[PDB]
Amino acid sequence: MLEYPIGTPQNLAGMEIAAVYLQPIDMEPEGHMRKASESDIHIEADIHALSNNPNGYPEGFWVPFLFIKYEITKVGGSGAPITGDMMAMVASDGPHYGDNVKLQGPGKYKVKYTIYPPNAKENPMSPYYGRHTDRETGVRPWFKTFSVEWDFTYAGI
Amino acid sequence: MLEYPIGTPQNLAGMEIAAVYLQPIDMEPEGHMRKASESDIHIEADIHALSNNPNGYPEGFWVPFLFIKYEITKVGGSGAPITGDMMAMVASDGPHYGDNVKLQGPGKYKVKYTIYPPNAKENPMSPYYGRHTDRETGVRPWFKTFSVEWDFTYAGI
């Protein structure tokens, strides 16, 4: 299989944050993602733990229960920025955060992800995840919400 | 601190299902886990992907967004079964499903876990996790809810 990079990964808060895209996908449950026929790409945030991750993740593990918002702006650029909220999902190459997106034609785009930890009140997965805090098995506090941004040139799949 | 085994792991549906326990833990958010001072153990379900996992997980990955119910019964003795729902959480050794539990003194206990996939109606994370189904990046359907059982001897902690 082939995927396409959006810039190069950025390392922050003990995680590698990478942006990639591929053709639009189909997902179970149906009717949540924008229809593949009405989309240009499936954009993803690939987030994995670095070595000595402060929240207890072994190096390379997928970081679960995050909430990621995105804003894609065409440089530059008559249309409104493209925005959305990713969904966590599994594919044949493992779990990702992703969304089907309709772009605004070929050209240069700015991509910004805003990444919320699993204790953020804005993150609807926060009620379902915890963090040990006892001395023997506890980990460091969650990172604070942050953003990452890249530029990429979209030509079309 | 010791991590005690509950039986030996069992392999089903491309996953290793293991049961272990340790001393009661403290967790953020507070007020979800039974107080550590009012508990005997923290019981865990350790679920990781085997090779050729049918849902797309690389070997060794934690299997996320499951929902686990447990039933702990003192073998052939007085006392009702002890039931509850685990919660997903991260510790210094990575993510787990777990819960703080009060037992009924030393002795032999049966431990049964009932494991619900992300698309089960009983799993509250169903609106928050998907599975690709397109030909190029799709995976096999989720497993159906199933149970696994072991027993162990509790001596104290």
User: Concatenated DSSP letters for B7-67?
Assistant: EEEEEETTEEEEEEEES---EESTTSSPPGGG-SEEEEEEEEE-TT-TTSPPTT-B--S-E
Structure tokens that stand for B50 in this block = 């085997």
**What is the Cα B73 distance to its own chain's centre?**
16
Structure tokens that stand for B88 in this block = 């997903």
User: Do the Cβ atoms of B110 and B151 come closer than 8 Å?
Assistant: yes
**C-alpha span between B25 and B93 (Å, rounded):** 13
Structure tokens that stand for B65 in this block = 């967004």
Q: List CB contacts of A110: < 8 A, sequence separation 6 or more.
A: A72, A73, A75, A149, A150, A151
From the list B36, B56, B134, the residue facing A90 with the nearest CB is: B56
**C-alpha span between A150 and B56 (Å, rounded):** 28
**What is the Cα A26 distance to its own chain's centre?**
17
Which one, of A147, A152, A153, A151, lies nearest residue A17 by Cα? A147
**C-alpha span between B126 and B35 (Å, rounded):** 28
What is the rounded end-to-end Cα distance, in angstroms, of chain B?
9
Q: Which DSSP letter does residue A105 get? A: S
Q: Looking at this protein, which amino acid is placed at residue A143? A: F
| Chain A positions with Cβ closer than 8 Å to B | 1, 22-23, 25-30, 32-33, 36, 55-58, 61-62, 64-65, 87-95, 119, 124-125, 128-134, 136-139, 141
- Decide if B136 and A23 are in contact by the 8 Å CB cutoff: yes
User: Do the Cβ atoms of B134 and A39 come closer than 8 Å?
Assistant: no
User: Do the Cβ atoms of A116 and A66 come closer than 8 Å?
Assistant: yes
What is the rounded end-to-end Cα distance, in angstroms, of chain A?
14
Q: Looking at this protein, which amino acid is placed at residue A81? A: P
**Max Cα separation, chain A?**
55
Q: List CB contacts of B60: < 8 A, sequence separation 6 or more.
A: B48, B49
User: Do the Cβ atoms of B61 and B114 come closer than 8 Å?
Assistant: no
Which one, of B15, B9, B11, B10, lies nearest residue B140 by Cα? B15
> Tokens 């990444």 appear where?
A115
Measured between CA atoms, the residue of chain B closest to residue A29 is B130
10 Å Cβ neighbour count for A72?
21
User: Do the Cβ atoms of A90 and B139 come closer than 8 Å?
Assistant: yes
Q: Which DSSP letter does residue B62 get? A: B
Mutate to test the interface with A, among B86, B121, B137 (most CBs of A within 10 A): B137
**C-alpha span between A17 and A5 (Å, rounded):** 12
Q: Where are the beta strands (DSSP E) in A51-145?
A: 67-75, 82-85, 87-91, 94-101, 107-116, 129-132
**How distant, in Å, are the alpha carbons of A93, A96, A143 from that of A67?**
20, 12, 13
Structure tokens that stand for A141 in this block = 């506090």
**C-alpha span between B85 and B91 (Å, rounded):** 18
How far is B78 from chain A, CA to nearest CA, in Å? 33
Mutate to test the interface with A, among B57, B90, B122 (most CBs of A within 10 A): B90
From the list B28, B64, B142, the residue facing A131 with the nearest CB is: B28
Q: Looking at this protein, which amino acid is placed at residue B151? A: D
- Spans of all domains in chain A: 1-157
**What is the Cα B43 distance to its own chain's centre?**
8
**C-alpha span between A92 and B136 (Å, rounded):** 8
User: Do the Cβ atoms of A86 and A98 come closer than 8 Å?
Assistant: yes
Q: Looking at this protein, which amino acid is placed at residue B77? A: G
Which one, of B34, B32, B53, lies nearest residue B17 by Cα? B53
Q: How many residues does chain A have?
A: 157
Resolution in angstrom units: 1.4
